[PDB]
């Protein structure tokens, strides 16, 4: 049958495509883990981030999110000893800050995950592009969303990382018209 052309090879990526990718997520932890790890793709390929994504969980998932917000600069330097993932004490520091800004949003009982949803009018977006080139990476919500995270102090929010967030987060549905799941004319 027809399938998404986003993947050229690497069977691991396709498995990730079927697992989620394009499925709207409302979990704050899933969105936080996506925006933080997505920064790794910068310069690196999407496949590189997925492999390290699993290793990243080994160093951060066990510590949980609230803990990093409660960790000190010595903790990031201590784990740096293990580089199973890209090495960059500066990037690790962003993780601690990510939990600090994220935790502040919860203090008002308003998850920051709900905030991004409001940027798209709490309404899901869908597209019927035929080729990947037809899909535009410049959208009014993606540009405004990056400015919002930048204000929070989030790093690695380039417009490219922002568009990737909606793609993995599922805010927008971009699976061309040859992915079976996306018909475009078959209700
Ligand atoms: Zn697809």
PDB file of C-alpha atoms and ligand atoms in Angstrom:
ATOM      1  CA  UNK A   1       0.000   0.000   0.000  1.00  0.00           C
ATOM      2  CA  UNK A   2       1.117   3.664  -0.026  1.00  0.00           C
ATOM      3  CA  UNK A   3       3.341   4.872   2.848  1.00  0.00           C
ATOM      4  CA  UNK A   4       4.853   8.146   4.126  1.00  0.00           C
ATOM      5  CA  UNK A   5       7.861   9.193   2.004  1.00  0.00           C
ATOM      6  CA  UNK A   6       9.353  11.183   4.910  1.00  0.00           C
ATOM      7  CA  UNK A   7      11.606   8.182   5.607  1.00  0.00           C
ATOM      8  CA  UNK A   8      14.098   7.155   2.901  1.00  0.00           C
ATOM      9  CA  UNK A   9      15.447   4.134   4.823  1.00  0.00           C
ATOM     10  CA  UNK A  10      16.501   3.260   8.397  1.00  0.00           C
ATOM     11  CA  UNK A  11      13.685   0.873   9.486  1.00  0.00           C
ATOM     12  CA  UNK A  12      13.927   2.370  13.005  1.00  0.00           C
ATOM     13  CA  UNK A  13      12.454   5.685  11.802  1.00  0.00           C
ATOM     14  CA  UNK A  14       9.435   4.006  10.160  1.00  0.00           C
ATOM     15  CA  UNK A  15       8.758   2.102  13.393  1.00  0.00           C
ATOM     16  CA  UNK A  16       8.761   5.503  15.120  1.00  0.00           C
ATOM     17  CA  UNK A  17       6.430   6.879  12.419  1.00  0.00           C
ATOM     18  CA  UNK A  18       3.811   4.182  13.139  1.00  0.00           C
ATOM     19  CA  UNK A  19       4.282   4.426  16.935  1.00  0.00           C
ATOM     20  CA  UNK A  20       3.261   8.121  16.939  1.00  0.00           C
ATOM     21  CA  UNK A  21       4.611  11.093  14.965  1.00  0.00           C
ATOM     22  CA  UNK A  22       1.541  12.992  13.699  1.00  0.00           C
ATOM     23  CA  UNK A  23      -0.614  11.975  16.687  1.00  0.00           C
ATOM     24  CA  UNK A  24      -1.727  14.987  18.837  1.00  0.00           C
ATOM     25  CA  UNK A  25      -0.190  14.660  22.326  1.00  0.00           C
ATOM     26  CA  UNK A  26      -1.621  16.413  25.404  1.00  0.00           C
ATOM     27  CA  UNK A  27       0.896  15.010  27.908  1.00  0.00           C
ATOM     28  CA  UNK A  28       3.170  17.746  29.297  1.00  0.00           C
ATOM     29  CA  UNK A  29       6.042  15.264  29.795  1.00  0.00           C
ATOM     30  CA  UNK A  30       5.883  14.074  26.160  1.00  0.00           C
ATOM     31  CA  UNK A  31       5.950  17.654  24.819  1.00  0.00           C
ATOM     32  CA  UNK A  32       8.750  18.683  27.200  1.00  0.00           C
ATOM     33  CA  UNK A  33      10.819  15.626  26.211  1.00  0.00           C
ATOM     34  CA  UNK A  34      10.251  16.419  22.518  1.00  0.00           C
ATOM     35  CA  UNK A  35      11.275  20.112  22.548  1.00  0.00           C
ATOM     36  CA  UNK A  36      14.386  19.350  24.651  1.00  0.00           C
ATOM     37  CA  UNK A  37      15.610  16.364  22.605  1.00  0.00           C
ATOM     38  CA  UNK A  38      14.544  17.939  19.287  1.00  0.00           C
ATOM     39  CA  UNK A  39      17.332  20.502  19.818  1.00  0.00           C
ATOM     40  CA  UNK A  40      19.786  17.614  19.316  1.00  0.00           C
ATOM     41  CA  UNK A  41      18.701  17.253  15.664  1.00  0.00           C
ATOM     42  CA  UNK A  42      20.168  20.724  14.983  1.00  0.00           C
ATOM     43  CA  UNK A  43      23.116  19.730  12.760  1.00  0.00           C
ATOM     44  CA  UNK A  44      22.310  16.067  13.439  1.00  0.00           C
ATOM     45  CA  UNK A  45      19.825  13.927  11.478  1.00  0.00           C
ATOM     46  CA  UNK A  46      16.396  12.981  12.874  1.00  0.00           C
ATOM     47  CA  UNK A  47      17.517   9.324  13.086  1.00  0.00           C
ATOM     48  CA  UNK A  48      20.457  10.346  15.301  1.00  0.00           C
ATOM     49  CA  UNK A  49      18.083  12.024  17.779  1.00  0.00           C
ATOM     50  CA  UNK A  50      15.784   8.970  18.081  1.00  0.00           C
ATOM     51  CA  UNK A  51      18.685   6.658  18.996  1.00  0.00           C
ATOM     52  CA  UNK A  52      20.075   9.154  21.524  1.00  0.00           C
ATOM     53  CA  UNK A  53      16.484   9.876  22.607  1.00  0.00           C
ATOM     54  CA  UNK A  54      16.419   6.416  24.198  1.00  0.00           C
ATOM     55  CA  UNK A  55      19.851   6.972  25.787  1.00  0.00           C
ATOM     56  CA  UNK A  56      18.751  10.439  26.948  1.00  0.00           C
ATOM     57  CA  UNK A  57      15.909   8.827  28.904  1.00  0.00           C
ATOM     58  CA  UNK A  58      18.489   6.604  30.608  1.00  0.00           C
ATOM     59  CA  UNK A  59      20.158   9.707  32.091  1.00  0.00           C
ATOM     60  CA  UNK A  60      17.107  12.007  32.539  1.00  0.00           C
ATOM     61  CA  UNK A  61      13.969   9.800  32.597  1.00  0.00           C
ATOM     62  CA  UNK A  62      15.249   8.033  35.733  1.00  0.00           C
ATOM     63  CA  UNK A  63      15.844  11.439  37.362  1.00  0.00           C
ATOM     64  CA  UNK A  64      12.331  12.540  36.306  1.00  0.00           C
ATOM     65  CA  UNK A  65      11.556  16.225  35.476  1.00  0.00           C
ATOM     66  CA  UNK A  66      10.859  17.830  38.872  1.00  0.00           C
ATOM     67  CA  UNK A  67      14.254  16.511  40.021  1.00  0.00           C
ATOM     68  CA  UNK A  68      16.283  18.389  37.351  1.00  0.00           C
ATOM     69  CA  UNK A  69      14.563  21.620  38.405  1.00  0.00           C
ATOM     70  CA  UNK A  70      15.736  20.722  41.913  1.00  0.00           C
ATOM     71  CA  UNK A  71      19.261  19.691  40.805  1.00  0.00           C
ATOM     72  CA  UNK A  72      22.366  21.897  41.047  1.00  0.00           C
ATOM     73  CA  UNK A  73      25.142  22.716  38.542  1.00  0.00           C
ATOM     74  CA  UNK A  74      27.259  19.931  40.088  1.00  0.00           C
ATOM     75  CA  UNK A  75      24.698  17.299  38.994  1.00  0.00           C
ATOM     76  CA  UNK A  76      24.970  18.196  35.294  1.00  0.00           C
ATOM     77  CA  UNK A  77      28.779  18.156  35.520  1.00  0.00           C
ATOM     78  CA  UNK A  78      28.731  14.769  37.307  1.00  0.00           C
ATOM     79  CA  UNK A  79      26.563  13.039  34.671  1.00  0.00           C
ATOM     80  CA  UNK A  80      28.658  14.607  31.886  1.00  0.00           C
ATOM     81  CA  UNK A  81      31.138  11.820  32.724  1.00  0.00           C
ATOM     82  CA  UNK A  82      28.805   9.539  30.740  1.00  0.00           C
ATOM     83  CA  UNK A  83      28.498  10.741  27.120  1.00  0.00           C
ATOM     84  CA  UNK A  84      26.184   8.006  25.797  1.00  0.00           C
ATOM     85  CA  UNK A  85      24.487  11.090  24.316  1.00  0.00           C
ATOM     86  CA  UNK A  86      25.889  14.238  22.659  1.00  0.00           C
ATOM     87  CA  UNK A  87      28.245  15.967  25.110  1.00  0.00           C
ATOM     88  CA  UNK A  88      27.507  19.584  26.070  1.00  0.00           C
ATOM     89  CA  UNK A  89      27.252  20.730  29.700  1.00  0.00           C
ATOM     90  CA  UNK A  90      25.598  23.856  28.278  1.00  0.00           C
ATOM     91  CA  UNK A  91      22.765  21.798  26.735  1.00  0.00           C
ATOM     92  CA  UNK A  92      22.317  19.822  29.967  1.00  0.00           C
ATOM     93  CA  UNK A  93      21.989  23.136  31.829  1.00  0.00           C
ATOM     94  CA  UNK A  94      19.070  23.960  29.517  1.00  0.00           C
ATOM     95  CA  UNK A  95      17.316  20.796  30.730  1.00  0.00           C
ATOM     96  CA  UNK A  96      17.442  22.025  34.345  1.00  0.00           C
ATOM     97  CA  UNK A  97      16.116  25.428  33.208  1.00  0.00           C
ATOM     98  CA  UNK A  98      13.412  23.685  31.149  1.00  0.00           C
ATOM     99  CA  UNK A  99      12.039  22.073  34.310  1.00  0.00           C
ATOM    100  CA  UNK A 100      12.284  25.387  36.193  1.00  0.00           C
ATOM    101  CA  UNK A 101      10.251  27.287  33.577  1.00  0.00           C
ATOM    102  CA  UNK A 102       7.901  24.319  33.132  1.00  0.00           C
ATOM    103  CA  UNK A 103       7.328  23.926  36.881  1.00  0.00           C
ATOM    104  CA  UNK A 104       6.467  27.642  37.175  1.00  0.00           C
ATOM    105  CA  UNK A 105       3.657  27.150  34.624  1.00  0.00           C
ATOM    106  CA  UNK A 106       2.162  24.356  36.770  1.00  0.00           C
ATOM    107  CA  UNK A 107       2.221  26.583  39.882  1.00  0.00           C
ATOM    108  CA  UNK A 108      -0.859  28.367  38.495  1.00  0.00           C
ATOM    109  CA  UNK A 109      -2.452  24.984  37.685  1.00  0.00           C
ATOM    110  CA  UNK A 110      -2.025  25.821  33.984  1.00  0.00           C
ATOM    111  CA  UNK A 111       0.268  23.257  32.264  1.00  0.00           C
ATOM    112  CA  UNK A 112       2.548  24.865  29.672  1.00  0.00           C
ATOM    113  CA  UNK A 113       1.424  22.047  27.347  1.00  0.00           C
ATOM    114  CA  UNK A 114      -2.047  23.631  27.368  1.00  0.00           C
ATOM    115  CA  UNK A 115      -0.414  26.985  26.507  1.00  0.00           C
ATOM    116  CA  UNK A 116       1.003  25.777  23.171  1.00  0.00           C
ATOM    117  CA  UNK A 117      -2.405  24.276  22.344  1.00  0.00           C
ATOM    118  CA  UNK A 118      -3.903  27.775  22.740  1.00  0.00           C
ATOM    119  CA  UNK A 119      -1.426  29.164  20.169  1.00  0.00           C
ATOM    120  CA  UNK A 120      -3.199  27.060  17.517  1.00  0.00           C
ATOM    121  CA  UNK A 121      -6.659  28.078  18.778  1.00  0.00           C
ATOM    122  CA  UNK A 122      -6.899  24.815  20.732  1.00  0.00           C
ATOM    123  CA  UNK A 123      -7.979  23.519  17.302  1.00  0.00           C
ATOM    124  CA  UNK A 124      -6.050  20.730  15.468  1.00  0.00           C
ATOM    125  CA  UNK A 125      -4.569  21.608  12.044  1.00  0.00           C
ATOM    126  CA  UNK A 126      -4.486  19.251   9.032  1.00  0.00           C
ATOM    127  CA  UNK A 127      -2.982  19.521   5.528  1.00  0.00           C
ATOM    128  CA  UNK A 128      -3.388  17.641   2.220  1.00  0.00           C
ATOM    129  CA  UNK A 129       0.032  18.282   0.656  1.00  0.00           C
ATOM    130  CA  UNK A 130       1.065  15.818  -2.075  1.00  0.00           C
ATOM    131  CA  UNK A 131       4.882  16.021  -1.833  1.00  0.00           C
ATOM    132  CA  UNK A 132       7.086  16.864   1.170  1.00  0.00           C
ATOM    133  CA  UNK A 133       8.205  20.025  -0.676  1.00  0.00           C
ATOM    134  CA  UNK A 134       4.560  21.184  -0.785  1.00  0.00           C
ATOM    135  CA  UNK A 135       4.486  21.156   3.035  1.00  0.00           C
ATOM    136  CA  UNK A 136       5.602  24.673   4.172  1.00  0.00           C
ATOM    137  CA  UNK A 137       7.874  24.906   7.228  1.00  0.00           C
ATOM    138  CA  UNK A 138       6.919  28.561   7.785  1.00  0.00           C
ATOM    139  CA  UNK A 139       3.571  28.919   9.598  1.00  0.00           C
ATOM    140  CA  UNK A 140       2.267  31.867  11.697  1.00  0.00           C
ATOM    141  CA  UNK A 141       1.785  29.594  14.732  1.00  0.00           C
ATOM    142  CA  UNK A 142       5.280  28.079  14.495  1.00  0.00           C
ATOM    143  CA  UNK A 143       6.919  31.526  14.413  1.00  0.00           C
ATOM    144  CA  UNK A 144       4.802  32.825  17.322  1.00  0.00           C
ATOM    145  CA  UNK A 145       5.269  29.598  19.295  1.00  0.00           C
ATOM    146  CA  UNK A 146       9.068  29.945  19.094  1.00  0.00           C
ATOM    147  CA  UNK A 147       8.837  33.499  20.467  1.00  0.00           C
ATOM    148  CA  UNK A 148       6.757  32.212  23.401  1.00  0.00           C
ATOM    149  CA  UNK A 149       9.265  29.511  24.396  1.00  0.00           C
ATOM    150  CA  UNK A 150      12.132  31.978  23.891  1.00  0.00           C
ATOM    151  CA  UNK A 151      10.500  34.304  26.445  1.00  0.00           C
ATOM    152  CA  UNK A 152      10.345  31.420  28.952  1.00  0.00           C
ATOM    153  CA  UNK A 153      14.127  31.104  28.506  1.00  0.00           C
ATOM    154  CA  UNK A 154      13.961  27.884  26.464  1.00  0.00           C
ATOM    155  CA  UNK A 155      16.981  27.317  24.192  1.00  0.00           C
ATOM    156  CA  UNK A 156      17.204  25.445  20.855  1.00  0.00           C
ATOM    157  CA  UNK A 157      13.809  26.730  19.660  1.00  0.00           C
ATOM    158  CA  UNK A 158      14.916  27.640  16.115  1.00  0.00           C
ATOM    159  CA  UNK A 159      11.987  27.792  13.683  1.00  0.00           C
ATOM    160  CA  UNK A 160      13.156  24.366  12.472  1.00  0.00           C
ATOM    161  CA  UNK A 161      12.881  22.878  15.980  1.00  0.00           C
ATOM    162  CA  UNK A 162       9.466  24.525  16.381  1.00  0.00           C
ATOM    163  CA  UNK A 163       8.111  23.015  13.161  1.00  0.00           C
ATOM    164  CA  UNK A 164       9.543  19.631  14.209  1.00  0.00           C
ATOM    165  CA  UNK A 165       7.663  19.990  17.529  1.00  0.00           C
ATOM    166  CA  UNK A 166       4.248  20.244  15.839  1.00  0.00           C
ATOM    167  CA  UNK A 167       5.254  17.331  13.582  1.00  0.00           C
ATOM    168  CA  UNK A 168       6.125  15.001  16.480  1.00  0.00           C
ATOM    169  CA  UNK A 169       3.668  16.581  18.930  1.00  0.00           C
ATOM    170  CA  UNK A 170       0.897  15.986  16.375  1.00  0.00           C
ATOM    171  CA  UNK A 171      -0.442  19.568  16.543  1.00  0.00           C
ATOM    172  CA  UNK A 172      -0.576  19.454  12.737  1.00  0.00           C
ATOM    173  CA  UNK A 173      -1.192  16.365  10.571  1.00  0.00           C
ATOM    174  CA  UNK A 174       1.351  16.208   7.721  1.00  0.00           C
ATOM    175  CA  UNK A 175       1.436  12.714   6.143  1.00  0.00           C
ATOM    176  CA  UNK A 176       1.071  13.569   2.422  1.00  0.00           C
ATOM    177  CA  UNK A 177      -1.741  11.674   0.642  1.00  0.00           C
ATOM    178  CA  UNK A 178       0.102   8.344   0.228  1.00  0.00           C
ATOM    179  CA  UNK A 179       0.277   7.311   3.910  1.00  0.00           C
ATOM    180  CA  UNK A 180      -3.021   5.389   3.848  1.00  0.00           C
ATOM    181  CA  UNK A 181      -3.933   6.870   7.253  1.00  0.00           C
ATOM    182  CA  UNK A 182      -4.353  10.194   5.410  1.00  0.00           C
ATOM    183  CA  UNK A 183      -6.867   9.808   2.514  1.00  0.00           C
ATOM    184  CA  UNK A 184      -7.899  13.379   1.641  1.00  0.00           C
ATOM    185  CA  UNK A 185     -11.092  12.205  -0.103  1.00  0.00           C
ATOM    186  CA  UNK A 186     -12.249   8.961   1.547  1.00  0.00           C
ATOM    187  CA  UNK A 187     -14.589   9.537   4.545  1.00  0.00           C
TER     188      UNK A 187
HETATM  189 ZN1  LIG B   1       2.491   8.840   7.630  1.00  0.00          ZN
END
